[PDB]
Design an enzyme around this catalytic site. Structure first.
Site, mmCIF file in Angstrom:
data_model
loop_
_atom_site.group_PDB
_atom_site.id
_atom_site.type_symbol
_atom_site.label_atom_id
_atom_site.label_comp_id
_atom_site.label_asym_id
_atom_site.label_seq_id
_atom_site.Cartn_x
_atom_site.Cartn_y
_atom_site.Cartn_z
ATOM 1 N N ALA A 108 11.085 72.946 60.805
ATOM 2 C CA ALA A 108 9.719 73.402 61.039
ATOM 3 C C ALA A 108 8.866 72.286 61.629
ATOM 4 O O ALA A 108 8.191 72.476 62.650
ATOM 5 C CB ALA A 108 9.112 73.922 59.736
ATOM 6 N N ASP A 146 19.629 67.583 66.256
ATOM 7 C CA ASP A 146 19.789 68.344 65.022
ATOM 8 C C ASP A 146 21.223 68.846 64.903
ATOM 9 O O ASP A 146 21.779 69.378 65.868
ATOM 10 C CB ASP A 146 18.813 69.521 64.978
ATOM 11 C CG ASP A 146 18.532 69.997 63.565
ATOM 12 O OD1 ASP A 146 19.375 69.767 62.674
ATOM 13 O OD2 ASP A 146 17.470 70.613 63.349
ATOM 14 N N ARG A 182 9.243 80.055 58.881
ATOM 15 C CA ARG A 182 8.342 78.950 59.171
ATOM 16 C C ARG A 182 8.607 78.266 60.502
ATOM 17 O O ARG A 182 7.786 77.444 60.925
ATOM 18 C CB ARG A 182 8.410 77.901 58.050
ATOM 19 C CG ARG A 182 9.779 77.267 57.881
ATOM 20 C CD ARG A 182 9.801 76.311 56.701
ATOM 21 N NE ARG A 182 11.068 75.599 56.595
ATOM 22 C CZ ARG A 182 12.192 76.133 56.138
ATOM 23 N NH1 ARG A 182 12.245 77.390 55.727
ATOM 24 N NH2 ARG A 182 13.292 75.388 56.091
ATOM 25 N N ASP A 238 14.729 65.911 56.191
ATOM 26 C CA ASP A 238 14.570 66.454 54.847
ATOM 27 C C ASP A 238 15.356 65.663 53.806
ATOM 28 O O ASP A 238 15.592 66.168 52.703
ATOM 29 C CB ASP A 238 14.972 67.932 54.805
ATOM 30 C CG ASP A 238 16.443 68.157 55.123
ATOM 31 O OD1 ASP A 238 17.125 67.211 55.568
ATOM 32 O OD2 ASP A 238 16.919 69.295 54.927
ATOM 33 N N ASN A 239 15.767 64.438 54.127
ATOM 34 C CA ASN A 239 16.480 63.601 53.174
ATOM 35 C C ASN A 239 16.084 62.149 53.396
ATOM 36 O O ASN A 239 15.549 61.782 54.444
ATOM 37 C CB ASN A 239 17.999 63.772 53.290
ATOM 38 C CG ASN A 239 18.506 63.538 54.695
ATOM 39 O OD1 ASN A 239 18.955 62.444 55.032
ATOM 40 N ND2 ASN A 239 18.444 64.572 55.522
ATOM 41 N N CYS A 298 24.470 63.852 27.043
ATOM 42 C CA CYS A 298 24.358 64.629 25.805
ATOM 43 C C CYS A 298 23.435 65.846 25.891
ATOM 44 O O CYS A 298 23.538 66.747 25.065
ATOM 45 C CB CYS A 298 23.848 63.703 24.707
ATOM 46 S SG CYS A 298 22.750 62.938 25.178
HETATM 47 P P1 LIG Z 1 13.694 71.268 57.066
HETATM 48 O O1 LIG Z 1 14.920 71.132 56.196
HETATM 49 O O2 LIG Z 1 13.220 72.641 57.474
HETATM 50 O O3 LIG Z 1 13.947 70.429 58.396
HETATM 51 C C1 LIG Z 1 14.868 69.343 58.415
HETATM 52 C C2 LIG Z 1 15.794 69.430 59.603
HETATM 53 O O4 LIG Z 1 16.360 68.120 59.873
HETATM 54 C C3 LIG Z 1 17.756 68.234 60.025
HETATM 55 N N1 LIG Z 1 18.376 66.982 59.587
HETATM 56 C C4 LIG Z 1 18.428 66.526 58.323
HETATM 57 N N2 LIG Z 1 19.083 65.340 58.259
HETATM 58 C C5 LIG Z 1 19.469 65.022 59.507
HETATM 59 C C6 LIG Z 1 20.201 63.906 60.146
HETATM 60 N N3 LIG Z 1 20.665 62.863 59.417
HETATM 61 N N4 LIG Z 1 20.392 63.964 61.481
HETATM 62 C C7 LIG Z 1 19.936 64.993 62.217
HETATM 63 N N5 LIG Z 1 19.264 66.037 61.703
HETATM 64 C C8 LIG Z 1 19.005 66.111 60.377
HETATM 65 C C9 LIG Z 1 18.160 69.450 59.202
HETATM 66 O O5 LIG Z 1 19.408 69.968 59.611
HETATM 67 C C10 LIG Z 1 16.976 70.388 59.434
HETATM 68 O O6 LIG Z 1 17.175 71.117 60.643
#
Ligand SMILES: *P(=O)(O)OC[C@H]1O[C@@H](n2cnc3c(N)ncnc32)[C@H](O)[C@@H]1O
Lengths: 294, 976, 76, 76
Positions: free
Chosen positions: B421, B446, B457, B518-519, B574
């Protein structure tokens, strides 16, 4: 020199060393030549690392090269990969006057890429192929329980702290609060039942089980098939303390031979005593075959 | 009901009640400029019942600066009619129509919410009066250059059902005092987190059972762990137990009409460093209409001094209060322009206000909101001749920034990571800005594919685009919007494995990086790349209604890695294993059981079946690993292999019995239910709940659901045809015989034996296949099994069960997301990108952004400067580094540092590797000393050096001449 | 002097400080009342991010002033 | 005699103690420098947890011995 002095002088040089745990393989890959619990997580992590992790690990190595505990009762030995500080193996000898006394317990330690923000991962390998629960905090699958190792809500002075917590602290926590003289009362709620005859009998039963478990796995299997990283440390430790180990196991046998008040505990104590005699005969057989280290 | 398969992420933000209310609301939107188009797009993606697009103006060249649904062929047509066809494709559940007639009183009665843009003063006043008199929510939005104005009037009596959007927090009770000011003390000194003046309710209270299910009571927080609930003497004595849960109290507020609210305005502060800005902006926006009336309906010319002076005089005459004259002149100089990111942000805010009006959720703006982005302008300003229109689609943007900034934009190269998004919104904004339309380029990458839940979204994707790559589809979509945009799209995941394409050369010609990931791993990697290549990076993140922007400038600010975020909360061993007390613990336990049963138990068997030489490969493994693999293969292939679906049902029944009867009986045997410690408190008290084994009942829907899901999944694992008949499974499960259970208080030879049993009895014709957990598919029965397992374990410990919605939210690690937050944070990030492209370096111009559209709240701060450290009196930051050229041996490297920098290297590392250290073995140290550094790196990292690698990065821990450690910058080693 | 701290999620905290405390002391008080470690706290006031080693007098935080406890987010 | 104590972070501290000093006295001396209250501390030597009332001579702790400071744990 006294035997304790010789042990202290000989085990001092080998507290912190490096071992070849990972070797080169085909097609730009690597394979483990030793059995590490966190191999899968190491492969999953890949090359990811936080920028502060390298400095934190260098400081931790500097600390570990000098600061590891060492005594005739208990000692801690740490081995790390020759090319990776985040992969380690820990050997802890059981403190005296405990059911784990003179027993070698091996742990696998892996530092995650988020270290020191996330706590390191530690797993007990001396579990007898998951058939032995050595402690209430040491589950038979290998998982180790410590409050210091958790970032859950808890209390600020009890959580994993990115500044005030360290690998040495975790090692001392394990070595002195898990290998307690009476492991039965480690479980919460059972702590207040101590002093009663029933609690004493339950603790005696638990100690009788742990006696044979440690005699089998912490001593006999370590002598027969020692880990490649701790082979000579284990050999030296068992050769220098064979008489003390034999005397301690004999004392355990005599204590287990005392009469019991309840039949339910008496049957289990007798069975554990017979198993411990069976394992002690084998241990005496193996100890005599130990060629004295140079 | 609400289509969860489409609104999955938005439901976790809004709720079923709110979405039901929005599904019965009609929206009228007046004015279809850039801001109106953004509002319409976000509202349609929200999923209102219907939206009517009304407009009287005709499309022109100036409208193309922000309207992405208008082309040059649409010049002369009505904007609303032209954009209605394209806007309808965003959501088929929303009825979109276009209106061109006058806004009569009878026509306005059909709409719950009315949004007015580009309306004149008289029409605004008339419509506001009519809406207030007839109970119609009214929102007025305007954008003038780099300025914004939002007004909200939701009626004389507006009810808010959830003031802040946060989930209620429940705490567990240790002791309650019995007196006139009874004090509740939390368990084992744990913070309740209750706000002062909160309302709570009590449940599972023993002794004070009158408080169970009672009406909410106002509390008084006496400390971080204790609070008072008033007089408790009228109830019985407290024994034990009790859970206090926060209750969300609705609030009713009154909105002043516009005609009143103008003279006594209440301002929502958007920037706390500009507290005096809204007062001046109110007067400026009010006097803009007077200036237009006095100049034949023409706005002041761009960057014209005479028109600015005339507007200042008009402002002076219209109001008696003192105003910032410099701010008035700056507003007048750029009020005739229009830009895309500001329109997107204001549209995102106004759409959130439309949703608030429709559903009654979250606190609205009370009542005026004024925003500006004056830091995007050059410090010296823009010359009048430079801002003149040139007959281009960017004329409204040149009216703000000038032609030179347009030329700079055309030659800019920017890299966008992630096409979600935020990535799609950034791509749209960059395309509308004209970035890379000349000699520049826009790179987007991506690795994921388009899913149906993403269409809620991400407005650049269509239902027929499912299973297509995100980056390529977004690139084509924004190519259609603006034909001049040059885009290169990649299907790669950024990391160490894709440095062949994203090499140092690729980063060398970049001008900046925009993060839409997103990470945290990807964020850290992109930071390391941006630090090494010294390019600015803009980081964006969202969570529900929350969002932030952080800007990183080389040699100016600290990096995203310089500060730390709270760690991911893990569950004590636990608490997962023996003593769960919340539905999260049971859900995590169910997920772990699913993994261990349906995936880990079959991986080794599948590998053995697929690979004929698997046995000889695993025979060389060290330790007990060969046994641990061979016995698992045997168990999966011979012992537990089901030959029919009846065997699968029997296995499911036995697994249910073992999980919910046998292990609980064992746990109760270990700890008796009535066990009480010496001091008095029972063992099964506080955070530990006493379990009770279940009794299997085929008539119970939960037990049958678990049996059905488990049997079907087990059959799927072994390739047996599934039997999706509930009656058949119920009939089959009643014939299963459950064995009685009672609680309890040479290696080479074994390997050869198991190998022999495998080659003799085991059959390679089997089709063992581990299952991958998928939560977005409703026909794979994964989520059904998870729900059944978690609910059964909850009923085991008397934990309240959770429905499929909450189970999917928790077990699936779903991150809630909405389109409004994404638009707002993308607009803010594009504003920071514009600031970077202008050439700003002083940290006051740049602003980290933080927002929560529920409160609503919006705040900004200057990025922190990079930390400074000194070695031998030389200052250095995270951006400085050493420069070592050529090919040197390890000994030559150490000697170079020891001789030039007077530093003795005690630990040299490359990434996670360790090239040199003080405690390394002497043999390896002697071996590695004469070798070149490239060969040493190749040996240590156990991988070849790719030709694209032109340099290496080393981290060194050094000691000064006096023997004390000193922190030093990293080393850039240039390969020959 | 009494100051207020507003969390990004809308919870209000009341602190009892003095015009001479240090940002470390303010963060320790916030830790006592909330539970976040001081290194994970981001205090915003008047467009400035408060940094360790300084006092409230430099930032001109007076009585009844409001601070903002913000955090970064991992979605997108 | 002199003894060392290694804290949570590995930082080593230097203390002076009597042979007859109670472990409570040692705990107070550590608090006088670093301040974690004594009932929270746990002192480690030769793998045994020292108990508050005994003297170092009871444990035969002797000059230049190193102690380890750890904290009371809580269960899993
Ligand atoms: P939201 O989860 O809607 O958007 C995040 C998008 O970023 C892409 N994505 C996450 N991590 C990576 C890496 N390491 N390289 C390229 N693209 C990434 C996700 O696939 C979501 O499209």
């Amino acid at each position: 020199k006294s035997i304790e002095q010789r042990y202290l002088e000989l085990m001092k040089k080998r507290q912190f060393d490096t071992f070849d745990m990972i070797v080169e393989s085909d097609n730009n890959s690597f394979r483990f030549v030793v059995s590490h619990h966190f191999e899968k997580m190491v492969r999953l992590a890949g090359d990811r690392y936080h920028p502060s992790r390298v400095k934190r690990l260098a400081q931790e190595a500097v600390t570990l090269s000098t600061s590891l505990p060492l005594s005739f009762s208990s000692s801690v030995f740490v081995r790390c990969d020759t090319d990776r500080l985040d992969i380690m193996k820990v050997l802890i000898t059981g403190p005296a006057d405990t059911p784990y006394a003179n027993g070698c317990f091996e742990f696998d330690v892996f530092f995650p890429p988020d270290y020191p923000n996330q706590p390191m991962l530690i797993n007990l390998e001396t579990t007898g192929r998951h058939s032995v629960r050595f402690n209430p905090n040491l589950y038979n699958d290998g998982k180790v329980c410590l409050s210091v190792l958790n970032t859950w809500h808890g209390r600020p002075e009890e959580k994993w702290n990115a500044q005030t917590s360290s690998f040495l602290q975790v090692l001392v926590s394990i070595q002195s609060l898990i290998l307690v003289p009476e492991p039965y009362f480690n479980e919460p709620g059972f702590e207040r039942s101590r002093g009663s005859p029933s609690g004493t009998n339950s603790s005696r039963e638990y100690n009788s089980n742990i006696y044979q478990a440690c005699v089998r796995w912490a001593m006999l299997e370590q002598i027969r098939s020692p880990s490649q990283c701790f082979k000579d440390v284990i050999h030296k430790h068992f050769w220098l303390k064979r008489e003390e180990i034999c005397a301690q196991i004999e004392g355990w046998i005599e204590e287990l031979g005392k009469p019991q008040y309840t039949e339910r505990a008496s049957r289990t104590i007798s069975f554990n005593s017979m198993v411990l005699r069976r394992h002690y005969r084998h241990l005496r057989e193996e100890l005599s075959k130990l060629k004295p280290p140079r | 009901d609400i289509d969860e398969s489409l609104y999955s992420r938005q439901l976790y933000v809004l709720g079923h009640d709110a979405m039901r209310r929005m599904a019965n609301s009609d929206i009228l939107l007046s004015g279809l400029g850039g801001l109106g188009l953004e509002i319409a797009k976000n509202v349609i993606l929200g999923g209102v019942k219907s939206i009517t697009l009304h407009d009287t103006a005709t499309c022109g060249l100036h409208d193309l600066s922000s309207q992405f649904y208008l082309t040059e062929a649409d010049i002369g047509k009505n904007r609303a009619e032209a954009s209605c066809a394209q806007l309808a494709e965003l959501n088929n559940y929303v009825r979109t129509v276009s209106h061109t007639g006058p806004l009569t009183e009878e026509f306005l009665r059909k709409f719950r919410v009315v949004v007015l843009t580009n309306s004149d003063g008289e029409e605004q006043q008339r419509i506001a009066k009519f809406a207030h008199e007839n109970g119609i929510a009214l929102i007025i939005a305007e954008t003038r250059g780099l300025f914004a104005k939002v007004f909200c009037d939701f009626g004389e009596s507006f009810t808010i059902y959830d003031q802040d959007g946060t989930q209620p927090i429940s705490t567990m009770i240790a002791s309650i005092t019995h007196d006139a000011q009874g004090v509740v003390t939390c368990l084992d000194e744990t913070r309740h987190g209750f706000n002062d003046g909160d309302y709570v309710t009590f449940s599972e209270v023993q002794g004070m059972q009158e408080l169970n299910g009672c009406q909410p009571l106002k509390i008084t927080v006496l400390g971080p762990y204790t609070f008072s609930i008033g007089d408790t003497s009228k109830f019985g004595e407290y024994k034990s137990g009790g859970v206090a849960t926060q209750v969300k109290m609705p609030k009713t507020i009154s909105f002043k009409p516009l005609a009143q609210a103008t003279e006594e305005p209440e301002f929502l502060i958007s920037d706390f460093a500009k507290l005096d800005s809204p007062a001046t902006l109110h007067v400026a926006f009010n006097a803009l209409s007077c200036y237009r009336k006095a100049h034949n309906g023409a706005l002041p010319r761009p960057w014209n001094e005479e028109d600015a002076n005339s507007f200042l005089e008009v402002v002076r005459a219209s109001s008696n209060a003192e105003v910032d004259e410099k701010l008035v002149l700056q507003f007048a100089k750029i009020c005739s322009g229009n830009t895309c990111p500001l329109d997107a942000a204001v549209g995102g805010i106004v759409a959130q206000e439309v949703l608030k009006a429709c559903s009654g959720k979250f606190t609205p703006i009370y009542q005026w909101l004024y925003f500006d982005a004056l830091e995007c302008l050059p410090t010296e300003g823009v010359e009048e001749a430079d801002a003149q229109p040139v007959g281009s689609r960017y004329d409204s943007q040149i009216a703000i920034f000038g032609k030179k900034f347009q030329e700079k934009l055309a030659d800019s190269k920017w890299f966008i990571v992630g096409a979600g998004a935020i990535g799609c919104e950034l791509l749209k904004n960059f395309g509308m800005l004209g970035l890379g339309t000349g000699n520049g380029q826009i790179f987007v990458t991506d690795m994921d594919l388009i899913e149906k839940s993403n269409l809620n979204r991400q407005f650049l994707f269509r239902p027929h685009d499912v299973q297509k790559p995100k980056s390529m589809t977004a690139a084509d979509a924004i190519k259609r919007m603006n034909p001049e945009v040059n885009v290169t799209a990649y299907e790669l995941r950024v990391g160490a494995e894709t440095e062949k394409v994203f090499s140092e050369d690729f980063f060398g010609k970049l001008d900046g990086v925009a993060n839409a990931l997103d990470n945290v791993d990807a964020r850290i990697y992109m930071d390391r790349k941006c630090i090494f290549n010294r390019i600015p990076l803009v980081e964006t993140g969202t969570l529900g209604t929350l969002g932030n922007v952080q800007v990183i400038v080389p040699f100016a600010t600290e990096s995203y890695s310089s500060s730390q975020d709270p760690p991911e909360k893990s569950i004590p061993i636990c608490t997962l294993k023996n003593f769960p007390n919340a539905i999260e613990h049971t859900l995590q336990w169910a997920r772990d059981a699913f993994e261990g049963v349906f995936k880990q138990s079959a991986e080794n068997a599948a590998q053995y079946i697929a690979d004929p030489q698997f046995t000889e490969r695993i025979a060389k493994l060290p330790g007990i690993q060969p046994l641990e693999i061979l016995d698992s293969i045997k168990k999966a292939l011979i012992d537990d292999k089901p030959k029919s679906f009846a065997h699968c049902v029997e296995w499911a029944r036995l697994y249910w019995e073992d999980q919910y009867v046998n292990q609980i009986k064992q746990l109760l045997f270990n700890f008796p239910p009535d066990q009480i410690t010496s001091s008095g408190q029972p063992f099964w008290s506080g955070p530990k709940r006493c379990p009770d084994p279940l009794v299997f009942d085929v008539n119970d829907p939960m037990h049958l659901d678990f049996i059905y899901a488990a049997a079907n999944l087990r059959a799927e694992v072994y390739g047996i045809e599934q039997v999706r008949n509930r009656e058949t499974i119920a009939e089959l499960v009643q014939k299963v015989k459950v064995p009685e259970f009672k609680p309890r208080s040479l290696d080479q030879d074994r390997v050869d034996k198991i190998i022999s049993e495998l080659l003799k009895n085991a059959d390679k014709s089997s089709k063992i296949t581990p299952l991958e957990f998928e939560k977005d598919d409703d026909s794979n029965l994964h989520m059904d099994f998870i729900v059944a397992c978690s609910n059964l374990r909850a009923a085991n410990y008397k934990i309240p069960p959770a429905d499929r919605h909450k189970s999917k939210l928790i077990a699936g690690k779903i991150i809630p997301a909405i389109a409004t937050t994404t638009s707002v944070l993308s607009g803010l990030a594009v504003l920071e990108v514009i600031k970077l492209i202008v050439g700003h370096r002083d940290l006051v111009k740049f602003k980290n952004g933080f927002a929560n559209l529920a409160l609503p709240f919006m705040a900004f701060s200057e990025p922190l400067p990079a930390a400074k450290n000194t070695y031998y009196g030389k200052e250095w930051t995270l951006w400085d580094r050493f420069e070592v050229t050529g090919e040197l041996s390890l000994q030559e490297f150490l000697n170079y540092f020891e001789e030039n920098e007077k530093l003795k290297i005690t630990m040299l590392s490359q990434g996670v590797s360790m090239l040199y250290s003080f405690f390394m073995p002497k043999a390896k140290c002697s071996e590695r000393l004469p070798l070149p550094m490239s060969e040493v790196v190749r040996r240590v990292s156990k991988r070849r050096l790719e030709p694209h690698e032109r340099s290496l990065v080393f981290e060194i821990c050094c000691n000064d001449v006096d023997g004390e450690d000193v922190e030093v910058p990293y080393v850039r080693y240039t390969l020959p | 002097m009494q100051i207020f701290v507003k969390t990004l999620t809308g919870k209000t905290i009341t602190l009892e400080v003095e015009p001479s405390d240090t940002i470390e002391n303010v963060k320790a008080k916030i830790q006592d009342k909330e539970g976040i470690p001081p290194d994970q706290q981001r205090l915003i006031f008047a467009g400035k991010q408060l940094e360790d080693g300084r006092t409230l007098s430099d930032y001109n935080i007076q009585k009844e002033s409001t601070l903002h406890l913000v955090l970064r987010l991992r979605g997108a």
